[PDB]
């Protein structure tokens, strides 16, 4: 599995990302956080929805265990998108579906400071991928 939301935590991505006011720093603290995305078995790539608003591939699945909490996985082509699935994975690994209609999927960027001078296609990438997260919530 992946470290996000449970050794990569919001409070960890806060102090990583809060000091940083430069573009090619953020960049390369995304590329260096995308590096712990670990690479999803094929078995696993098979099952996931592969999400059609992204410069390169991204897939995203999810499981959830019936005590409630949702767990996700996925993989991107990418380096900077790893990233920022990995940022996103830590917004929402480990929460109920209440818990995810409740906040903003996307809530977590704008507090690192990870939206403004974003390309035009990741944001879509991105948006996408809030979207995808809405629609597991629902479907439980």
Same mark, same amino acid.
């Not at 409630?68 to 993989?75: A, E, L, R, S, V």
């Given at each position: !599995? &992946?470290?996000? #939301?449970?050794?990569?935590?919001?409070?960890? *991505? =806060?102090?990583?990302? @809060?000091?940083?006011?430069?573009?090619?720093?953020?960049? =390369?603290?995304?590329?260096?956080? !995308?590096?712990?995305?670990? +690479?999803?078995?094929?078995?696993?790539?098979?099952?996931?929805?592969?999400? @059609? $608003?992204?410069?390169?591939?991204?897939?995203? #699945?999810?499981?959830? +265990?019936?005590? #409630?909490?949702? &767990?996700?996985? $996925?993989? %991107?082509? $990418? =380096?900077?998108?790893? !990233?920022?699935?990995?940022?996103? *994975?830590?917004?929402?690994? !480990?929460?109920?579906? +209440?818990? *995810?209609? @409740?906040?903003?999927?996307?809530?977590?960027?704008?507090? /690192?400071? /990870? =939206? @403004?001078?974003? %390309? +035009? %296609?990741?944001?879509?990438?991105?948006?996408?991928?809030?979207?995808?997260?809405?629609?597991?919530?629902?479907?439980?």
């Amino acid at each position: !599995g &992946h470290p996000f #939301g449970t050794t990569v935590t919001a409070e960890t *991505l =806060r102090n990583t990302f @809060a000091p940083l006011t430069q573009w090619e720093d953020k960049y =390369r603290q995304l590329i260096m956080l !995308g590096k712990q995305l670990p +690479a999803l078995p094929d078995e696993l790539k098979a099952q996931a929805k592969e999400i @059609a $608003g992204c410069e390169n591939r991204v897939w995203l #699945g999810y499981t959830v +265990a019936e005590n #409630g909490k949702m &767990h996700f996985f $996925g993989d %991107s082509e $990418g =380096r900077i998108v790893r !990233g920022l699935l990995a940022v996103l *994975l830590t917004a929402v690994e !480990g929460k109920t579906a +209440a818990e *995810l209609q @409740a906040q903003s999927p996307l809530a977590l960027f704008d507090e /690192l400071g /990870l =939206r @403004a001078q974003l %390309s +035009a %296609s990741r944001s879509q990438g991105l948006n996408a991928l809030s979207e995808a997260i809405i629609a597991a919530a629902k479907q439980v």
